[PDB]
Amino acid sequence: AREVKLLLLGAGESGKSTFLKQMRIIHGQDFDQRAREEFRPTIYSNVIKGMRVLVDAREKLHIPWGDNKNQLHGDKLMAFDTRAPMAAQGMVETRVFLQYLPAIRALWEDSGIQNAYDRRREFQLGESVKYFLDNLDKLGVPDYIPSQQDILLARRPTKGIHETHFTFKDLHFKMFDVGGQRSERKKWFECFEGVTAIIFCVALSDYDQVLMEDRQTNRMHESMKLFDSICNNKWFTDTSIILFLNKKDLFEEKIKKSPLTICYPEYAGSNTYEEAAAYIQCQFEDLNKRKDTKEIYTHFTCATDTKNVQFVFDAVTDVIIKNNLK
Amino acid sequence: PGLVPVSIIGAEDEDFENELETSQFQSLEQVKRRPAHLMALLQHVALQFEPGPLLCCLHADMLGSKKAFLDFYHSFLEKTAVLRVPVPPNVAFELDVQRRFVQEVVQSQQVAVGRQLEDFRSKRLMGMTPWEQELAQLEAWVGRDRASYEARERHVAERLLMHLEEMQHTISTDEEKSAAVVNAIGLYMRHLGVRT
Ligand SMILES: Nc1nc2c(ncn2[C@@H]2O[C@H](COP(=O)(O)OP(=O)(O)O)[C@@H](O)[C@H]2O)c(=O)[nH]1
Numbered sequence A: 001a002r003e004v005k006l007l008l009l010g011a012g013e014s015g016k017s018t019f020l021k022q023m024r025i026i027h028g029q030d031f032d033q034r035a036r037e038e039f040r041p042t043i044y045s046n047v048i049k050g051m052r053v054l055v056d057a058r059e060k061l062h063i064p065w066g067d068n069k070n071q072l073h074g075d076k077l078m079a080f081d082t083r084a085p086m087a088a089q090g091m092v093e094t095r096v097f098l099q100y101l102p103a104i105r106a107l108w109e110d111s112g113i114q115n116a117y118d119r120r121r122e123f124q125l126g127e128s129v130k131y132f133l134d135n136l137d138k139l140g141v142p143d144y145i146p147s148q149q150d151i152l153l154a155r156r157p158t159k160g161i162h163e164t165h166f167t168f169k170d171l172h173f174k175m176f177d178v179g180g181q182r183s184e185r186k187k188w189f190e191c192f193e194g195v196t197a198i199i200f201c202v203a204l205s206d207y208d209q210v211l212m213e214d215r216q217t218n219r220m221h222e223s224m225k226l227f228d229s230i231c232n233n234k235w236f237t238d239t240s241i242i243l244f245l246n247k248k249d250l251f252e253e254k255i256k257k258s259p260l261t262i263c264y265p266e267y268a269g270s271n272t273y274e275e276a277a278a279y280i281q282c283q284f285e286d287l288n289k290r291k292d293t294k295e296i297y298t299h300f301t302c303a304t305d306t307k308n309v310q311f312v313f314d315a316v317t318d319v320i321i322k323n324n325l326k
Numbered sequence B: 001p002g003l004v005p006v007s008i009i010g011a012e013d014e015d016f017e018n019e020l021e022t023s024q025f026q027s028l029e030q031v032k033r034r035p036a037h038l039m040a041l042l043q044h045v046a047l048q049f050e051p052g053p054l055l056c057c058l059h060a061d062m063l064g065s066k067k068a069f070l071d072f073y074h075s076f077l078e079k080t081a082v083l084r085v086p087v088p089p090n091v092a093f094e095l096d097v098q099r100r101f102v103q104e105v106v107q108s109q110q111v112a113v114g115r116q117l118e119d120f121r122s123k124r125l126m127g128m129t130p131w132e133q134e135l136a137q138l139e140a141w142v143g144r145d146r147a148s149y150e151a152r153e154r155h156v157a158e159r160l161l162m163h164l165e166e167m168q169h170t171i172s173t174d175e176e177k178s179a180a181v182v183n184a185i186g187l188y189m190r191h192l193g194v195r196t
């Protein structure tokens, strides 16, 4: 009766872990000041490495500088050693971060580097590096403490399975977070036992991006393939399957400029948030071979927004209850 | 199959350095010899599709040196058999020459066996298949000793065959269809060298 096992799934970078943090923030132990600090060395590591990619992108994509003076700033950054002990762990000390801030601020205001970021759809880069590069000010202070939103926007690749417990609406939730990458999926099968519900996350923002395992496969294309295998698994015939179309904030601003035909050559519709988003949702629910028996509970979320996550999760719990304790 | 280097550096590429760089299930005639690999396929099918066609093919081709046709007709072709398989309207009516009949049942299961091997392949790549670990670990094996390899395959098959036995409450609601399958799979595995 009151024992619930939930599985967070989806392809890589869809927002799964961002969700856990939201859960911890709204239900479990919300992040203490000291907890947030732990996210500092990683935030500085998203910034510096994100930039490393931009500067490499500029030279590779052949984007003329906006100031040739910043070429000496570019070297300083390429010099950064990423295989060192702490940097390998995806961490960067304040002492050293502050040693690059000057070159980062300059390279960030450069026009050439900006045009590179605008063409990011051609190389692996987390669009959360932009949120930090615009806040270099609050980050350049002595003792900087990540805010509640900074933690959520922080990035860290997840490998393996991560279990979590918490009580909400008198139900004992056993929430598991996994890694989405292809090599990470084999580890999934160790959790297909007695699943009460599955929340398959998808990122609307990458219908124009490629996988990082093979820079030649549409992310959104993999998400659909991955969903068709889960949603139709004999292990989940009696499991409530919730689908989260995440990153609606980034998509709503994405369609306007880059087209959606980059993913659906047959999409004859318009580049509207309402019309395109409604198109994608059908792209998925259609993969359902058991449209009669199996039901999919779709939702448009924004994992980084707490209020939205709290609203949507409350609607997800009411579904789990009606489908079991009836 | 051929690799290629990345153009632009990805921030989290070193985090997956040894995970990158990825035809074992092209035909049944190929995997029917590999006990371990077959247990990976045998699971996928038994669990997701109908074990009929696949098992039939295995028990069929098992023939090659009598009484086998006796139990065969009682588990697959029997109008009331548990693991009934879709047979041609031709032989259905017609029920040494045994050769033509068996051969005529297999060919009708080609489209099904072929279509499930492909489904397995598809899942394989996406990483949505079980036992990939043991499967892969059984691939990166070097040695001037051939017969020794086959040796460990048998033990792996045993591990999987048991793991698939103890926990099989997913084949189908039918508490008996599962007994037939495990048994069928059991018998064939014994033909390779798997202890039961
Ligand atoms: N802007 C925005 N960022 C998001 C959203 N969902 C997740 N993120 C961020 O995008 C990145 C990927 O999230 P992550 O949970 O690590 O994806 P996972 O690999 O599936 O766990 C992290 O930087 C998150 O901060 C969203 O809806 N909007």
Ligand code: ALF
Pocket (backbone or CB within 6 Å): A010, A011, A012, A013, A014, A016, A017, A156, A157, A158, A159, A178, A179, A180, A181
């Ligand atoms: F990209 Al992941 F969890 F799937 F960090």
Ligand SMILES: [Mg+2]
Pocket (backbone or CB within 6 Å): A016, A017, A018, A156, A157, A158, A178, A179
């Ligand atoms: Mg994660």
